[PDB]
Design a protein around this ligand. Structure first.
Ligand SMILES: [Mg+2]
Ligand SMILES: [Mg+2]
Ligand SMILES: [Mg+2]
Lengths: 226, 196, 195, 222, 212, 233, 204, 195, 196
């Protein structure tokens, strides 16, 4: 997995590749690693996929209830604190490595969080197996006062480094943009640089090819009237 | 980590490098290891980032609640709360913390809490992997009741050497000044301290 | 405990179970009955870790006898085998799991059919025409795969079993001191007292 | 503790035609999650119309191929420039591998060429030298992703004649070289999609009575 | 793997399966587990593929040298003992072999020696070796007679491999059959287990457990 | 079997249109102690080859002496020693690769990862890697250890396939290499600021730059970073 | 000793035009020993289909569990559960056993009765959802199934074409796995008829 | 190989040795002769690790046959047993030691006495009226301690052996497929072909 | 061990503590770790006493035989002989040796040979367990071309700190001066160096 987060002028952007692997095998070619915690707080997850999904939804649920209770729009530091205290308690066994970002009444924020519950702050971050490929690009092209367009470009360039150079990452680039005073725009499959080429042959079979012993209509209906 | 805290004539200064490490990979080169648990009681963190952050967050909570009930806590009190956490959970923590604060009666104070959770009140303290390389230097160059500038220089020079030899340490040198005059943050970049 | 076999013929289920009990170096007994009657038309044989086998078998027996009294009614073999599977599946994630494998042979008086259920200590259940646990199947399944017919008589089943036991006596390293054979049919459970 | 072995990934495939043979392999060389090279050739022309690939641990693979080529060189010196037949090459390679039975070449070797009747031939070896003549053989990382496909699309396994419903097998008609290359490319394209170590490039060496020819195709680089 | 060999009136039958696995993954279904040592001698392949291949073709070379030097066919006793003595030299190093060395000579008659990588050498009438051995033994033990016709013996060996291929996950593919006479061995074909199973089920009425 | 004691980190390299560049920092680490600061890990052989070595330094020094001894040996009874029968990069590499594989085969490795960079007689660029296992490979860019993870992706943006080599100038390539060395200094805890760089060009020969430094570093943004989540001051 | 490959078995599912297909082998073994050739691995709750590979006791247990939960769901909701919802229930249920999981690889297949959209999904033992357009694979021959599906599959196949494709993908994958085979079943699922076909295959 | 017994009566030595050969899970043979004639009046039985047993037995046999030819003379049982002890004691500090235990039964034609020697793989030698290796003695020694007399006939020895083998067949877990019995006396070595 | 060697204007000085240790027990508190392999080529020994003694004895033998055949060996030559032994026997040695000598052409020279058997020519070198604590101090206080007295002070102060912090080090500070003027042995006792 490759995930990044980049701050810009008036907000924050996160991106991620779309490959999930079982050892050397690609289980899903178009995985969604960008998670919504609240409308304007999204986080990218690397590590154990079930853990990143589960911990993201639990905290998301509790954040929603908190927002309703306080009559306030949720803040990123709350999602951060809730995530880290949960993860720390499980001493790393919940394998969720997250880049947490969003906008709230306080401003725009970017954090990352390791599975053991240690957190950090920055203008640009990366996590996952492709984090070194990504970080090399971030350390090469990042500057102060990025515009929205510059940050999207930098973020997806860093995901591409991971896609091309890391065997743990591949397929497509997802992006989410969180700008102050605007709706978050989740850009699913922002890039598509890995369409499979056309096959040499069609493997559609002549009907009747397969040997059959028995057929039966399976009854999916409930018990019938009359 | 290279961290230290030094008492001087007008109070105390905390200092740290900014490197966080996962093996040979620098996970963060601009880390803030100088953390605030009260307006004028801060700490330097070394060991597991997860452990030291969790501890500092809890201590800050205790001292906020202390303040609401009994007014401003002493630096000694802050150190005791840290110690309780570090001592009672010694089997599950990797945390070496220096606690530094400024009272008006007691002036500048420094308490170091090593791995086992013991407490040691000192005129100055050094800790983290980088500290080993500056025991000689710091012992030879520390005097009591230095001025603000002499103390800033002592810490800058000391952590410069610790960074020079310890690959785990590096980045910028952060400092936090604690006096009656308030709270001052300082930063020193590679090109300044490396050539010293 | 070592070898336990089951075969389901036309109108009955036959269970054969070894008589030996070995405490490491010596054979302590050569006439051990590795079976418990659960209800008048259901029999369960068992093999696995010492102590746990009988403890489990008797526990199941008590529960089914309790059910029989409460409802004044005999549970079907399928129902009994499901209860037993659940208890083993329960046990496999316990602090200390039952290491017990069982064959349940019952005659369903409602459907007038003999039924044989194979359940291992993990709670892995399977309905079968014939079955075994441990190494028993390795020697005997090739004979049963050859000779077995769904419409065999009880005596044809016993002859096929006689052959199975002879192969075991030829090729197994352990002396298991013969088998006790029991038949489960519409009239209940009886023991073949010569084998 | 020093581990004398490594795993450079890679996947290779050999198919015996009626009067030709192909030996294909990807050109990606990896350690763990890193790419060492997107084009590091892995299938070699060994002389006397024999092609060879030794897949797995590249250091051992290179050593073996070097030694076999050298074996061919000395076969000529010692037996009056006699051409080394494919069956003879195979037996020789067994002795090369088994000579290190107690410290093996950590590779799965495949060679291809023509037999002495001009028929297509592939031979496959385990690391310590047991070998079979084969029609169809993939090796390395994505072998398991490729062979079941080939069983179905080359040998027509599990395919029957429509109308007969299972009584009459789809008959085993003979494949051309262009037809085989199609199956090789689709094999590696499919493997590239689902195996992280497969990708970058596909290089195929084809062997006919006229000699050894090369074809190369790009693969996905993610 | 399942391999067998048995002595009878008509000589020796040798029958083997054809499967090779790396864990769960079936690497090949076309492995030749009968090694043709020479035109009069056969060896079976179980345990290490290379060990069996390498050392049993090596054995063929030693047998050839023997009859060049002695101007006389090598005895099965002597041929088997060359192999067992060789592997016994390597004991502890990690060879893996379970094999039946089979031949029919004038002085001995039909003879089978079970040879083994930890040094065992056993003369016997019936031997089964491999992960499927217990299944093959069952069929053999209940149908074996010294007075089997060459035709029935060939079938019994085929049927025993079939039994093992069905139950043992690590045996399958095809059956390979051999008949060993005094004048040499005769190959009796490759028989795909897929097709053979259905044919035997129908013609024999066995495997009622399986729906076909 | 041993364990490496005093070690050198990444060696990075790439091909450009007329030659090759290779670079490596001047540090000899001793665990996390940055012990030795004046260590040259690029060793030129003749004036057409540079051998860059990472890993155990004692073993590097041994290889360094093998290479000096190889030059001596090649000169013996060789009137064309500084001409047609001079040492090629391909000869030097194959010799090392032979040694490395033999040493792993005797279970006593030279604990290194080596890159041999140079230009052949006919002007062709040579760039190949070998390590303690005797594993070898070629690529338009090559890097060892940490550099494989962080330098390669940057250098591959410049030269991504064979066709990109004619398009790449020595200035662009050197810029990319120098930038990669800065990144490695930001992120590798066993890297130093000081490094050496060598260009082997088919026209200008061998330029060997000592005492280089990482400069134009971005650290200013550090001052805006406070706490690890909620802390404001 | 590895629980997910003690008993063996496989499941594959595919989408076509206004239909889905889910298929499984019938083997149950104790490692090398084949034990049963009639151990079906596909179950259904109303119009939602669930295939489960892995440790057989957990396969049985989970079927019994989802029958329990979908029955109560129906009584309270007064309607049959949809595939999208069931997928979430499967995920929830598995993750609730995060640190002592069921050793399974479940696969969900069905057509949403309101929208008519065909739906498939796969899970790891710990609840992670793989919602693929094309196909889902599971079991001890999952590598082989990935190989077959990746070349054999094309989108928008008609029910009786999809049948050939999924059958061929299963059969040939099973024949390269020691622990799969011994029979096979294919379910072809349309909005208001479901056809279940048993395949003829080699029995070794 | 499992059970090997020896008993020395008035005028002969009797060796009984199990017939089974087991390769882990299956009994490969049930008629194996675990004995080698060393000279016309000396017999050696053996048990231990597979392969090594026969390799050792045949090696000793060759050496004694060689000695017999060179000197045109038969070595005494004591002499043969000392040679054999030395070879095992030699082997115990080897790179790979022979794991073989033996009983040597000989009739000394010079002293007109039967003699039984027990030697384990360490080269631990002992002359005995009766002996065994492995677990065999644990079951049988209490019977031999009771019934044995120095002046028993050959048939009284066989009856005492019959009893010993019956106890083994009752209490041993392993099926060793009976014993081959051989008698060593003044007229040489013969086999009792019914037991 | 705390050992060091320092080149200065007139040649080179070697210095060492005098503590030999078996666990916590000081087996010898007056050890001589400054060992002579030639008239004006000496070494400082750290690591296993058995290993470093055996190595020095062999080197002394080689250089005596060298001298008989080819005259006085260079300091570089001496260091190479040490290296050959340490490098070729790396798997069975625990030896960190500093080699220091005085030529008339080359003047003072210092070569350090760490655990792996690599060689490093330096203006000065420090080694032994105690050295870690004085990397900072020595780096800040060493200049080139010091006088004899300044160099004696540098070593005295440096090893004083190393001894102060390293429990493995202690006893007396021994030094050996190597110049054109001959060979001078020096000794400094606890009461002198501790109070520094
Ligand atoms: Mg990638
Ligand atoms: Mg099978
Ligand atoms: Mg001390």
């Amino acid at each position: 997995t490759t995930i990044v987060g980049v701050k810009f002028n008036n907000g924050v952007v996160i991106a991620a590749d779309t490959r999930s692997t079982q050892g050397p095998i690609v289980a899903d070619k178009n995985c969604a690693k960008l998670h919504r915690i609240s409308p304007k707080i999204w986080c990218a997850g690397a590590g154990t996929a079930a853990d990143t999904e589960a911990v993201t939804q639990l905290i998301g649920s509790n954040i929603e209830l908190h927002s309703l209770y306080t009559s306030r729009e949720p803040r990123v530091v709350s999602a951060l604190q809730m995530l880290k205290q949960h993860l720390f308690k499980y001493q790393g066994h919940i394998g969720a490595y997250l880049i947490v970002a969003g906008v709230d009444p306080t401003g725009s924020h970017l954090f990352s969080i390791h599975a053991d519950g240690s957190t950090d702050v920055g203008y640009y971050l990366s996590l996952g197996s492709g984090s070194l490929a990504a970080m090399a690009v971030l350390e090469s092209h990042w500057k102060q006062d990025l515009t929205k367009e510059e940050a999207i470009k930098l973020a997806s360039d860093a995901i591409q480094a991971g896609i091309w150079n890391d065997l743990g990452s591949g397929s497509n680039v997802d992006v989410c943009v969180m700008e102050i005073g605007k709706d978050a725009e989740y850009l699913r499959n922002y890039l598509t640089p890995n369409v499979r080429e056309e096959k040499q042959k069609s493997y559609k079979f002549p009907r009747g090819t397969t040997a059959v012993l028995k057929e039966s209509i399976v009854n999916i209906c409930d018990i019938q009237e009359e | 980590t290279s961290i230290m805290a030094v008492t001087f004539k007008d109070g105390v200064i905390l200092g740290a490098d900014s490197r966080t490490t996962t093996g040979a990979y620098i996970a963060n080169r601009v880390t803030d290891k100088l953390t605030r648990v009260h307006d004028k009681i801060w700490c330097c963190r070394s060991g597991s980032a997860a452990d030291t952050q969790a501890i500092a967050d809890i201590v800050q909570y205790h001292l906020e609640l202390y303040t609401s009930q009994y007014g401003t806590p002493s630096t000694e009190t802050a150190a005791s709360v840290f110690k309780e956490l570090c001592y009672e959970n010694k089997d599950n923590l990797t945390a070496g913390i220096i606690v530094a604060g400024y009272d008006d009666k007691n002036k500048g104070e420094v308490y170091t809490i090593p791995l086992g959770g013991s407490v040691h009140k000192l005129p100055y303290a050094i800790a983290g992997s980088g500290s080993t390389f500056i025991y000689g230097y710091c012992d030879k160059n520390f005097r009591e009741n230095m001025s603000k500038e002499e103390t800033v220089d002592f810490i800058k020079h000391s952590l410069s050497q610790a960074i020079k030899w310890d690959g785990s340490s590096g980045g910028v040198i952060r400092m936090v000044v604690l006096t009656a005059a308030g709270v001052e943050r300082l930063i020193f970049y590679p090109d300044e301290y490396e050539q010293l | 405990m070592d070898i336990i076999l089951g075969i389901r013929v036309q109108d009955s289920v036959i269970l054969a179970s070894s008589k030996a009990v070995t405490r490491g170096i010596s054979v302590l007994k050569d006439s051990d009955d590795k079976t418990r009657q659960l209800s008048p038309h259901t029999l369960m044989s068992f093999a696995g870790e010492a102590g746990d086998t009988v403890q489990f078998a008797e526990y199941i027996q008590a529960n089914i006898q309790l059910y029989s009294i409460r409802e004044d009614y005999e549970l079907s073999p399928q129902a009994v085998s499901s209860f037993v599977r659940q208890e083993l599946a329960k046990s496999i994630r316990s602090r200390r799991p039952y290491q017990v494998n069982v064959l349940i042979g019952g005659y369903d008086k409602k459907k007038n059919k003999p039924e044989l259920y194979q359940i291992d200590y993990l709670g892995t259940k399977v309905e079968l025409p014939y079955g075994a646990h441990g190494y028993s199947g390795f020697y005997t399944f090739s004979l049963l795969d050859h000779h077995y017919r769904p419409d065999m008589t009880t005596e044809e089943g016993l002859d096929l079993l006689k052959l199975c036991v002879q192969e075991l006596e030829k090729r197994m390293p352990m002396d298991f001191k013969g088998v006790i054979v029991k038949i489960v049919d519409k009239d209940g459970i009886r023991q073949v007292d010569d084998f | 503790q020093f581990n004398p072995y490594g795993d450079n990934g890679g996947t290779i495939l050999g198919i015996a035609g009626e009067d030709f043979a192909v030996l294909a392999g990807d050109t990606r060389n990896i350690t763990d999650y890193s790419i060492n090279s997107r084009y590091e050739p892995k299938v070699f022309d060994c002389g006397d119309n024999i092609v060879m690939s030794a897949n797995g641990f590249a250091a051992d693979g290179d050593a073996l191929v070097k030694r076999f080529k050298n074996s061919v060189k000395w076969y000529h010196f010692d037996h009056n420039d006699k051409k080394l037949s494919i069956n003879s090459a195979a037996r020789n390679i067994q002795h090369l591998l088994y000579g290190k039975r107690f410290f093996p070449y950590y590779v799965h070797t495949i060679i291809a060429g023509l037999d002495e009747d001009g028929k297509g031939a592939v031979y496959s070896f385990d690391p310590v030298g047991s070998y079979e003549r084969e029609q169809c053989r993939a090796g390395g990382a994505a072998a398991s992703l490729i062979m079941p496909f080939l069983d179905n699309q080359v040998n027509f396994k599990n395919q029957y004649e429509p109308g007969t419903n299972g009584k009459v097998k789809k008959p085993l008609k003979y494949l051309s070289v262009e037809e085989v290359i199609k199956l090789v490319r689709d094999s590696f394209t499919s493997a590239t999609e689902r195996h992280i170590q497969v990708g970058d490039g596909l290089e195929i060496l084809i062997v006919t009575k006229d000699g050894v020819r090369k074809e190369f195709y790009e693969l996905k680089r993610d | 793997t399942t391999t067998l060999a048995f002595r009878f009136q008509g000589g020796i039958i040798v029958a083997v399966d054809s499967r090779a696995t790396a864990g769960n993954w079936v690497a090949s279904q076309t492995v030749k587990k009968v090694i043709e040592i020479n035109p009069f001698l056969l060896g079976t392949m179980a345990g290490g593929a290379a060990d069996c291949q390498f050392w049993e073709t090596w054995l063929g070379s030693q047998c050839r040298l023997h009859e060049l030097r002695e101007k006389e066919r090598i005895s099965v006793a002597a041929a088997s003992k060359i192999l067992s003595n060789l592997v016994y030299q390597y004991k502890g190093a990690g060879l893996s072999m379970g094999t039946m060395i089979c031949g029919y000579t004038r002085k001995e008659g039909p003879t089978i020696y079970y040879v083994d990588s930890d040094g065992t050498r056993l003369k016997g009438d019936i031997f089964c070796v491999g992960s499927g051995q217990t299944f093959a033994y069952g069929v053999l033990d209940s149908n074996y007679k010294w007075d089997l016709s060459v035709e029935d013996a060939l079938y019994l060996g085929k049927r025993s491999i079939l039994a093992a291929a069905h139950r043992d996950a690590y045996s399958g593919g095809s059956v390979n059959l051999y008949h060993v006479t005094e004048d040499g061995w005769i190959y009796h074909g490759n028989h795909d287990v897929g097709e053979l199973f259905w044919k035997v089920k129908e013609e024999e009425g066995s495997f009622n457990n399986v729906i076909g | 079997t041993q364990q490496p004691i005093v070690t050198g980190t990444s060696v990075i390299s790439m091909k450009y249109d007329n030659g090759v560049i290779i670079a490596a920092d001047n540090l000899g680490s001793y665990g996390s102690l940055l012990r030795f600061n004046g260590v040259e890990r690029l060793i030129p052989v003749g004036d057409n080859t540079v051998v860059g070595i990472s890993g155990d330094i004692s073993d590097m020094q041994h290889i360094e002496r093998l290479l000096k001894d190889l030059v001596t040996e090649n000169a013996y009874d060789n009137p064309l020693a500084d001409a047609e029968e001079a040492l090629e990069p391909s000869y030097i590499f194959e010799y090392l690769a032979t040694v490395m594989y033999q040493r792993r085969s005797k279970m006593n490795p030279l604990w290194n990862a080596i890159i041999v960079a140079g230009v052949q007689s006919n002007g062709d660029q040579f760039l190949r890697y070998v390590n303690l296992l005797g594993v070898t490979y070629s690529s338009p860019t090559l890097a060892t250890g940490f550099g494989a993870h962080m330098a390669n992706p940057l250098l591959r943006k410049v030269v991504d396939r064979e066709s990109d080599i004619p398009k790449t100038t020595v200035q662009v390539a050197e810029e990319a290499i120098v930038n990669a060395m800065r990144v490695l200094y930001y992120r590798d805890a066993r890297s130093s600021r000081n490094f050496s760089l060598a260009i082997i060009d088919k026209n200008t020969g061998l330029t060997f730059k000592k005492n280089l430094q990482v400069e134009n570093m971005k650290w200013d943004f550090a001052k805006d970073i406070k706490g690890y989540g909620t802390q404001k001051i | 000793s590895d629980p997910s490959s003690i008993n063996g078995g496989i499941v594959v599912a595919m989408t076509g035009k206004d239909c889905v297909a889910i298929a499984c082998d019938l083997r149950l073994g104790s490692q090398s020993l084949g034990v049963s050739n009639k151990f079906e691995k596909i179950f259904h709750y109303g119009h939602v289909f669930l295939g489960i590979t892995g440790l057989a006791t957990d396969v049985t247990t989970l079927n019994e569990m989802f029958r329990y939960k979908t029955n109560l769901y129906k009584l309270k909701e007064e309607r049959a559960i949809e595939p999208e919802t069931f997928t979430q229930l499967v995920s929830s249920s598995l993750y609730e056993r995060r640190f002592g999981p069921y050793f399974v690889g479940p696969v969900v297949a069905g057509i949403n009765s309101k929208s008519g959209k065909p739906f498939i999904a796969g899970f790891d033992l710990i609840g992670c959802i793989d919602e693929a357009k094309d196909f889902i694979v599971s079991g001890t021959a999952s590598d082989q199934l990935f190989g077959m599906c990746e070349s054999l599959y094309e989108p928008n196949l008609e029910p009786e074409d999809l049948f050939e494709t999924i059958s061929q993908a299963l059969l040939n994958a099973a024949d390269r796995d020691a622990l799969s085979g011994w029979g096979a079943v294919v379910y072809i699922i349309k909005k208001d008829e479901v056809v279940k076909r048993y395949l003829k295959m080699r029995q070794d």
